[PDB]
Amino acid sequence: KRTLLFKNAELLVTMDDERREIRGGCLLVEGNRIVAVGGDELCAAPADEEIDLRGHIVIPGLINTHHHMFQSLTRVIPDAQDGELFDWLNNLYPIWAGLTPEMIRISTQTAMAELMLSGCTTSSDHLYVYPNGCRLDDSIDGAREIGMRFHACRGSMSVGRSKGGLPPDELVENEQAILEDSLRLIHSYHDAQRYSMLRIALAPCSPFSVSRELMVKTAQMAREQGVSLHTHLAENDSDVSYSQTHFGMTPAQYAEDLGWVGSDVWHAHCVKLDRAGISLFARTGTGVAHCPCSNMRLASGIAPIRAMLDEGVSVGLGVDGSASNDAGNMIAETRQAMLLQRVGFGPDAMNARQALEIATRGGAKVLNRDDIGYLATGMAADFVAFDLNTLNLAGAKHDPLAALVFCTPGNVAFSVINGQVVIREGVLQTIDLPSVVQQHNRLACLLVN
Amino acid sequence: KRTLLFKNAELLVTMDDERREIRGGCLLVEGNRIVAVGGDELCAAPADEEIDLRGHIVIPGLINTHHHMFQSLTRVIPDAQDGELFDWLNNLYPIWAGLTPEMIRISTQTAMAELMLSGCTTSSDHLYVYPNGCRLDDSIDGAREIGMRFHACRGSMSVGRSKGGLPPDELVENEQAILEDSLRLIHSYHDAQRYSMLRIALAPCSPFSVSRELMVKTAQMAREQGVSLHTHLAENDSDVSYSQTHFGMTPAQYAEDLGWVGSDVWHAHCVKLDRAGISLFARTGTGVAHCPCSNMRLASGIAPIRAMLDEGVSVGLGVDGSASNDAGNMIAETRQAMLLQRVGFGPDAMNARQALEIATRGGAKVLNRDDIGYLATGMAADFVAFDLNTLNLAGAKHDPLAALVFCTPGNVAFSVINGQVVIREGVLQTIDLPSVVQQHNRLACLLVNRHR
Ligand SMILES: [Zn+2]
Ligand SMILES: [Zn+2]
């Protein structure tokens, strides 16, 4: 098996069980997994390829736990730039009706490229529209070319505007079709073993877009098949009122009532989750995908992340779809989580290591994976390296780790995913990025005009 | 004098009085000023050099209205990353006591380089510590090397621990020395003419950091000499309580009491300004430097920027010192101003164009300048260009202007300051940037390992 040695990192951040931060640290990789982590004599190890990381910080690859990568074709749509969750959706649904399988394939690559160059090695997605013959398969095809570790969610909507829901009737599907497609996707694509590069989750989009019947059946199938469940929960005030008006419950009560609690569940946003819901999630092991830029750009609110963490809730990080961020920058999202918790809850609400922990270990937890998220023997060989001698970080070498969260670094210098060196000296190796960006912009023009 | 044609920008954002956004726009420059703004008809203009901006957006240069560039040597100090503001100041003051003139010279260039590469063409600074023979002259020297348009503030502190303050016995100066140095700096450096590359302002660190007498003479000297006044005001709950307890008035009332209102005054932060203070600033023309990343990173609060703007207060943008941000990224700070206003006050509190106006015209206004901040005939030739065909902006060409605020672009592709092309295809031209960064980190190492 192919061996790879990364040697002489200025700081090697492990996020391991001792949270070791090794000066001069070295990483030895074999195949897709880590052999050993340390300094000293391990740096003298021969290997099939050695890469010198002097002047760089190495961290575990960041883990993105919420996205809508198809929306990277529709950033800053003029009619959608100003306004809240509902109304924003109302202006964007008509544009998304034009999506083709090619747009799904290319936009998965574009969004994934932006995430990979900003430090991310594992991401989920939440594709929930399937017009014009689009399939989750098209997104999987693109994810396979670019080499990122992928948790593909079969998103869905069934309750159109005629039935008391939000999406237009054209963009929703029949619930039996959804369940059959979900089962097909699991059987064809879900790899449940260690170091898997592709897993499937089931993800009805939100309580205002799907029936409770589909929520229960989806959960039943996921438990039967051994896969996770994902949805939007308590994103803003309208979300909370809709659930109170239509179902007589808080979003947390509604989730538990449907079986959507447990370590195989993770909810996006949870901005308006109440103290009772936080305790419920803590005791059931239910996960949260925190999306701070989205929560700001849509004026959703400040999620009570510090309160969730203090009760033992599992919190990961997500950029959300690029029509509500509108960036796809993972390390910048980690910075935002620190800044927003501090402005919301005080100077002790979130430091650099706590935010980075959410962005790594927290993401592994909410995706229900124990093989990513930190660097130790037997873990997946997923990590990135930032050049510390850039202008962006000048004067911040007093703490190379905090520098990534308190400053605004550029792209990663190196990225390793599943043992593959996918980024080399700032250059994405697995696709022709200028060509994909070029195609992406042509398709985006086609989609909107 | 040298002439320059920038042609065929995908979108040329002028921020002029009609807020023209010109498809295919062109800019004709002579010396330090804009000769014409228009479309392809400008391509028949002769020029010493043509620069093709196809695929790029051009905007007016961003204007930074608050900084402490010396702190770029002391980012993420472990003792100061977390904790309360008392611990922030108390742990950083002893380190800044080691600052040398060379450190001031170099860190000005480092901080200005980060600002310039992120879209900024004019900045103020607020140097308020002068140990070991450091002088505002040293930062002026570094700014002249890099070519940025510069509003250098003679910051000051006089109230040390002996008089109930925080800084050590000294970072604080004798109050007569401060004024004599202030007058010297004005006489030696302040250039009051149009297109000036250097202006001086007087900037006690806060109204509580100097005697009431010093606040008053300083304002008197500034008015006599025709220069502006700058300070920290109403940054947090402690400032409001101190001034209400100790002086019996709100910070804005105390500012009015000292003569620190007027169009030649701009106050940093103003996070905790009340409705009455907002009205006072609106009618006196007093400016605000809004610093969103610092206000979050130090847990100060959300400044009521939308309320200030609705009342007619002049608001600019600032990154603040690099120990309280800790980035020096101007376009990211413009994004943050939008994001933070929306989460504080709702989806109508700030759009991309309103945020970009604050970052350009708003900064020009609070610096009391009518020759920068937008692109029109006779305005200073200060503008930057971002490549629209990058990964970062992929799928955002539906609105090239909003893309700069809603996405996270990389460095500018081109920057022109006072007619000089200071950045060319992403490369800073006026200094050897890798060498300056090397010196900067070496000096930062020396500074933190000093005996104290
Ligand atoms: Zn979402
Ligand atoms: Zn300041």
Side-chain angles (χ1 to χ4, degrees), chain A, chain B residues 1-162 164-452:
Chain A
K1 312 213 268 147
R2 170 61 145 220
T3 57
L4 180 70
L5 176 73
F6 274 52
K7 82 185 163 239
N8 315 134
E10 177 154 346
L11 188 68
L12 200 184
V13 181
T14 67
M15 290 291 172
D16 72 10
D17 295 335
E18 323 184 78
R19 301 306 191 277
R20 303 194 292 160
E21 297 176 23
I22 313 177
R23 303 222 163 270
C26 292
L27 231 49
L28 181 69
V29 169
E30 179 198 62
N32 58 1
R33 75 193 167 175
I34 292 155
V35 167
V37 182
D40 307 324
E41 298 311 309
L42 185 66
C43 301
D48 301 334
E49 188 194 1
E50 305 183 10
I51 300 185
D52 176 30
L53 282 202
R54 277 194 262 91
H56 292 69
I57 176 170
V58 173
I59 60 168
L62 303 179
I63 298 176
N64 180 59
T65 63
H66 189 64
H67 212 315
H68 303 300
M69 309 183 155
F70 67 91
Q71 294 171 7
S72 64
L73 291 158
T74 60
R75 305 200 228 200
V76 297
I77 297 296
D79 298 344
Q81 294 182 13
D82 319 330
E84 53 276 275
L85 191 66
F86 314 17
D87 292 38
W88 169 89
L89 284 177
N90 291 346
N91 295 259
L92 287 173
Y93 284 134
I95 293 140
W96 295 334
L99 284 166
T100 71
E102 194 199 348
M103 296 171 184
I104 301 294
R105 187 179 69 73
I106 294 286
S107 66
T108 296
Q109 286 172 68
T110 307
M112 278 195 172
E114 193 177 344
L115 287 176
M116 293 164 75
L117 277 157
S118 58
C120 176
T121 60
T122 298
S123 180
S124 62
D125 193 24
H126 192 195
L127 167 68
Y128 60 84
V129 294
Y130 296 91
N132 308 306
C134 286
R135 299 176 302 146
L136 189 60
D137 314 60
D138 302 306
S139 185
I140 292 167
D141 284 339
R144 271 165 173 181
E145 325 211 341
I146 201 164
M148 175 154 27
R149 194 180 304 280
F150 191 26
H151 281 234
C153 295
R154 176 52 159 97
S156 71
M157 297 186 300
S158 63
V159 168
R161 258 193 212 118
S162 64
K163 295 215 263 292
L166 201 42
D169 290 353
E170 155 38 70
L171 272 194
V172 308
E173 329 161 62
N174 154 281
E175 299 190 335
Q176 150 147 16
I178 295 161
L179 292 165
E180 283 171 8
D181 196 47
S182 307
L183 196 59
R184 171 190 73 87
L185 288 161
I186 285 158
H187 286 341
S188 308
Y189 292 112
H190 182 68
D191 179 8
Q193 52 221 5
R194 209 169 167 82
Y195 318 114
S196 165
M197 280 299 274
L198 178 59
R199 297 202 173 158
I200 305 289
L202 305 182
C205 182
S206 63
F208 50 88
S209 65
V210 297
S211 83
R212 269 136 55 107
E213 170 149 318
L214 180 70
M215 291 283 297
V216 172
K217 292 171 150 173
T218 300
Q220 165 167 64
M221 176 175 298
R223 268 71 195 247
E224 181 146 345
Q225 295 301 313
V227 302
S228 285
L229 296 153
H230 179 62
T231 194
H232 294 112
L233 201 67
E235 182 168 356
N236 70 352
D237 287 326
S238 324
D239 204 348
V240 171
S241 288
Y242 184 102
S243 278
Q244 188 61 231
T245 278
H246 285 52
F247 313 123
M249 310 192 192
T250 72
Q253 293 174 322
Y254 157 104
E256 160 173 56
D257 180 80
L258 301 178
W260 278 66
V261 290
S263 57
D264 61 346
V265 185
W266 89 104
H267 294 286
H269 298 303
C270 293
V271 171
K272 306 295 177 185
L273 190 79
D274 57 8
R275 274 136 147 107
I278 295 176
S279 297
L280 170 69
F281 282 18
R283 79 177 154 261
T284 56
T286 308
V288 169
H290 177 43
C291 304
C293 286
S294 177
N295 298 343
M296 296 177 80
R297 180 253 178 268
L298 287 175
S300 297
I302 305 187
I305 298 308
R306 167 53 41 201
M308 302 172 190
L309 292 169
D310 285 352
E311 302 225 14
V313 176
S314 295
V315 180
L317 199 62
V319 296
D320 205 357
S322 302
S324 63
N325 185 307
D326 287 14
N329 184 323
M330 200 57 214
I331 193 66
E333 200 80 18
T334 307
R335 164 164 172 77
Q336 199 67 43
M338 176 171 78
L339 297 181
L340 187 65
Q341 276 313 283
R342 283 182 177 203
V343 85
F345 300 102
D348 282 325
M350 185 77 77
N351 67 17
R353 286 160 176 75
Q354 290 166 333
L356 189 62
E357 266 183 62
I358 292 170
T360 55
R361 279 196 172 248
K365 189 54 172 145
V366 306
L367 298 182
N368 200 20
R369 290 194 75 131
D370 66 6
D371 57 342
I372 57 182
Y374 66 91
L375 306 171
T377 298
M379 283 319 266
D382 293 7
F383 49 89
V384 302
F386 287 93
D387 188 355
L388 295 173
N389 291 303
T390 67
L391 170 60
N392 309 53
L393 308 180
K397 293 170 101 176
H398 315 297
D399 183 342
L401 185 166
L404 301 182
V405 183
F406 279 81
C407 305
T408 58
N411 293 341
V412 300
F414 295 91
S415 172
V416 179
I417 304 178
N418 214 42
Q420 188 188 15
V421 187
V422 297
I423 290 163
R424 276 184 189 277
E425 287 182 271
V427 176
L428 189 53
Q429 302 289 298
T430 53
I431 58 159
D432 180 357
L433 179 64
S435 163
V436 165
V437 168
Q438 198 197 60
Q439 294 168 64
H440 181 101
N441 284 327
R442 175 179 56 76
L443 297 165
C445 181
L446 231 52
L447 176 65
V448 181
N449 300 97
Chain B
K1 254 111 190 170
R2 186 114 181 280
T3 55
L4 282 181
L5 173 70
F6 298 82
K7 54 178 178 104
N8 304 126
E10 179 152 340
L11 187 70
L12 164 53
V13 175
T14 69
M15 293 283 152
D16 62 19
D17 296 346
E18 286 181 340
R19 300 296 188 287
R20 295 192 298 166
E21 306 183 8
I22 306 166
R23 292 311 256 190
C26 300
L27 285 168
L28 183 65
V29 166
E30 180 194 309
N32 56 13
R33 51 161 208 286
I34 292 168
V35 172
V37 186
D40 76 83
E41 69 271 12
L42 271 183
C43 296
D48 295 336
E49 185 190 354
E50 270 185 6
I51 293 173
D52 167 48
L53 289 176
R54 170 165 40 267
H56 294 72
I57 174 169
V58 173
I59 61 169
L62 311 178
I63 297 170
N64 183 57
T65 61
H66 188 62
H67 213 317
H68 306 297
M69 300 180 162
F70 67 93
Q71 303 179 356
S72 66
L73 291 160
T74 66
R75 312 203 221 198
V76 299
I77 297 287
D79 271 3
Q81 288 171 26
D82 316 333
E84 199 260 32
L85 181 64
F86 173 96
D87 305 306
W88 185 90
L89 294 160
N90 267 271
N91 296 341
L92 288 169
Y93 275 139
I95 300 172
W96 297 332
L99 283 162
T100 70
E102 175 193 4
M103 287 177 194
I104 299 303
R105 182 169 69 245
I106 287 296
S107 61
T108 302
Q109 297 173 54
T110 305
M112 279 179 179
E114 192 181 346
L115 285 176
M116 283 157 80
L117 278 161
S118 63
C120 183
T121 56
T122 296
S123 178
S124 62
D125 192 30
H126 190 187
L127 176 54
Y128 62 88
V129 296
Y130 294 93
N132 310 309
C134 292
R135 301 180 298 155
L136 191 62
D137 309 64
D138 297 306
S139 100
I140 286 159
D141 286 345
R144 282 164 164 188
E145 262 218 278
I146 200 166
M148 196 168 194
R149 195 182 299 283
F150 193 24
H151 281 234
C153 296
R154 181 33 159 108
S156 66
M157 274 174 337
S158 70
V159 169
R161 285 178 164 183
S162 314
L166 301 105
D169 256 334
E170 100 165 13
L171 299 181
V172 311
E173 268 190 279
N174 165 265
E175 291 203 336
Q176 213 39 242
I178 289 163
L179 282 150
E180 297 176 15
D181 193 61
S182 295
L183 196 57
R184 180 194 56 99
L185 284 171
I186 292 172
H187 289 346
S188 308
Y189 293 118
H190 179 75
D191 171 5
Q193 330 281 43
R194 194 181 180 73
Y195 314 121
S196 167
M197 275 315 268
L198 181 57
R199 294 197 174 161
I200 303 294
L202 310 180
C205 189
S206 87
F208 321 135
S209 326
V210 305
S211 80
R212 150 174 197 112
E213 181 188 75
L214 182 56
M215 289 294 282
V216 179
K217 295 118 154 73
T218 296
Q220 225 197 300
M221 181 184 282
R223 267 68 195 250
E224 271 159 15
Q225 296 296 318
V227 303
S228 282
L229 297 149
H230 181 53
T231 197
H232 297 109
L233 197 79
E235 181 176 359
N236 50 55
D237 290 324
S238 160
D239 292 350
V240 177
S241 304
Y242 185 92
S243 94
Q244 191 53 260
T245 282
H246 222 199
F247 294 115
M249 42 207 322
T250 82
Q253 265 155 18
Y254 191 57
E256 181 176 38
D257 199 61
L258 305 155
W260 274 67
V261 285
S263 65
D264 53 354
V265 184
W266 87 106
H267 290 291
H269 301 303
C270 293
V271 173
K272 302 305 184 184
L273 209 68
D274 49 35
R275 182 178 247 269
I278 291 183
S279 298
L280 170 67
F281 283 18
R283 60 171 176 280
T284 64
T286 306
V288 175
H290 174 44
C291 299
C293 284
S294 172
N295 294 338
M296 294 164 89
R297 180 252 178 269
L298 281 176
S300 305
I302 305 188
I305 299 309
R306 174 87 263 133
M308 296 173 195
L309 292 176
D310 286 352
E311 193 70 13
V313 172
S314 304
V315 184
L317 201 70
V319 294
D320 205 0
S322 294
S324 69
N325 184 306
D326 287 5
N329 183 326
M330 208 47 204
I331 191 60
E333 201 78 21
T334 306
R335 169 168 165 80
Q336 199 62 238
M338 193 190 77
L339 288 179
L340 187 66
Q341 272 319 280
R342 290 186 165 203
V343 86
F345 306 101
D348 305 331
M350 185 74 73
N351 62 38
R353 285 157 173 81
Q354 294 168 321
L356 190 62
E357 293 191 26
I358 293 168
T360 50
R361 297 179 70 108
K365 190 55 110 163
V366 307
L367 295 184
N368 198 19
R369 287 199 82 137
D370 64 5
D371 55 337
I372 61 183
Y374 62 94
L375 310 173
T377 301
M379 291 304 282
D382 295 4
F383 46 89
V384 305
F386 289 89
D387 181 358
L388 290 172
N389 289 294
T390 68
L391 172 64
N392 311 44
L393 302 184
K397 304 219 276 175
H398 317 298
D399 183 346
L401 193 166
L404 296 188
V405 190
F406 279 79
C407 306
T408 56
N411 293 343
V412 303
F414 294 91
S415 169
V416 182
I417 304 179
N418 215 47
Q420 158 167 227
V421 183
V422 293
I423 293 165
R424 200 178 276 276
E425 283 155 57
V427 179
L428 183 57
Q429 298 296 299
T430 56
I431 60 177
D432 179 350
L433 178 64
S435 177
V436 170
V437 166
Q438 192 183 44
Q439 284 178 254
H440 182 101
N441 282 321
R442 164 177 81 70
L443 288 167
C445 186
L446 182 70
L447 181 73
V448 294
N449 280 287
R450 159 178 100 90
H451 181 44
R452 48 193 188 287

